[PDB]
């Protein structure tokens, strides 16, 4: 009852949960990952010198509090213009902020105000960061999309500068945090990345607060084929070390026939809980029925998943 | 008791004298020009099909009541992209909307309230409108931003398409009006092509107010070559006819060498005021110092022409 909630995640797996989270008596600070750089916000990483705005305008989207057609512009996707079709103007509108200040999370601030958001929202940097990612035949990938694409096994994932650094801020809410949930989002291209900052881990471990590991309803392909529970919980032990998650939430229920069919159209497979090696790897087990179809796809269901983590 | 006041202008002129009017006790209601081709705003006319929304852009920064730091983000433009270079976030931000609503008068309705504008201020046209000059020699130019760019001399300048439609919310304000305002603005590519919208230049001769007509201080290049303020009052009559301007304003004391040299560079020389010319059309003429060197570049003083206007 009126907890302080820490969450490192990414992609549509992060909004979907965020929109659900506030509602509840939480406080949040959402740590969003600077890395990718595919689509709107990769070219504008690259031609602008920014880190990518794609994710946070995300988040920021899923924490506003506006009308409706204040949320449709700020997601408003350009068709035509060659140049600028394909950009966001969220992103665009990020971007110009920037700019003016010259500081990404300076300018997330102040978007956020705009957007009247509960709670805070910070970059996992203030500059971008490059994501690389060691094969298990020994071949490096570098860039964040590029790693799926290489069609390769995962064997470990890296952060580039390695003088990055997260901020004042970030590492002061993981103290304060009551909570920190780590996912829910890709394991290897959104929430390695993130926990992955310098400083990071070490800081996660030394909280006292309670660490929720939201892991992967389906795998993916290039990234976690054939991954279990255990494996998506194993590869963050790996990365970041022990005592980095107290308790793992997973849909334990079956999947929809034609849900599961979807998917498999593209490399994709339901996630296997193996509840004894989980139990192995010294965490707890969070298991219910925790999402729910839309249009064949899959999302979390932030109530039921809020309700979960906060006890 | 609030004077309702409409004003026919175009471009930085329109938005200088806008950001002092609306300080008085006064109801504004600028209505826009929405044919010009030049720039950002040609570009997205072009790709995205929807009418130029820079000259808006500025009236509605103008009349705009935000934090510095939101206007500036308003009035951003990208320097780098080269697909996204040139273009101001505020034109795209207006273009986004125009999308979303399929109505450009509506999408800028919509950003009147995000910048809690004090006022009202609508488009000539809800759809684009094509410039166009008939050359003394007879020639064509298409284009608003062509035509001074042929070096030749303006005869009569008039719009494509012919059906193109005001918005009722335009005839109306021109009917409630107490004043109505021509200019600030280039004659032939600002203030023209706004009174030339069919219904105009009617509806105006039967409004009973006050107006008007803030002339040129400086000639243009390929536009107003010699002219002078007769020559402006001149061509707005002999497109629009008589009954369209009571008075005219014109700055009667002299421009420093300084101002007139950086001008001369642009083939730009003052407008000499012919007390006589401006009598024989039947207009009254109201001289005073209504500019003010800004870093050598001449605006207006829009209290001084404010307070004119407001008799």
């Known amino acids: 009852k009126k907890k302080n909630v820490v969450v490192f995640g990414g992609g549509t ?50 924490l506003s509090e506006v009308e409706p057609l204040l949320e449709q512009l700020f997601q408003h996707r350009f068709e035509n213009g060659n140049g600028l079709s394909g950009h966001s103007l969220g992103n665009l509108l990020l971007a110009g902020m920037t700019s003016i200040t010259g500081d990404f999370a300076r300018g997330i601030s102040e978007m956020s105000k705009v957007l009247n958001v509960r709670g805070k929202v910070l970059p996992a940097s203030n500059r971008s960061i490059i994501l690389h990612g060691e094969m298990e035949d020994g071949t490096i990938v570098t860039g964040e999309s590029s790693i799926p694409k290489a069609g390769k096994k995962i064997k470990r994932v890296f952060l580039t500068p390695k003088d990055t650094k997260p901020l004042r801020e970030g590492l002061e809410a993981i103290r304060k945090a009551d909570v920190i949930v780590i996912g829910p ?37 290039g990234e976690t084929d054939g991954y279990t529970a255990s494996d998506h919980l194993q590869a963050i032990m790996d990365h970041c070390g022990v005592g980095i998650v107290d308790d793992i939430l997973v849909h334990g229920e079956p999947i929809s026939d034609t849900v599961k069919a979807k998917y498999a159209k593209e490399k994709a497979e339901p996630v296997i809980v193996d509840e004894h090696k989980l139990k192995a790897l010294g965490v707890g087990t969070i298991s219910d029925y925790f999402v729910l179809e839309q249009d064949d796809v899959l999302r979390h269901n932030a109530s039921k998943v809020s309700e979960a983590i906060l006890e």
């Open 185 to 221: 989002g890709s394991l290897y291209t959104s929430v390695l990345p993130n926990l992955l900052v310098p400083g990071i881990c070490e800081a996660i471990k030394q909280s006292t607060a309670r660490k929720v590991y939201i892991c992967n309803v389906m795998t993916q392909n």
């Open 13 to 62: 797996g992060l909004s979907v949960l965020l929109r659900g989270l506030k509602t509840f008596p939480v406080s949040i600070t959402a740590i969003v990952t600077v890395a990718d750089d595919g689509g709107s916000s990769g070219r504008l990483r690259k031609e602008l010198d920014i880190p990518p705005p794609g994710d946070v305008r995300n988040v920021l989207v899923a």
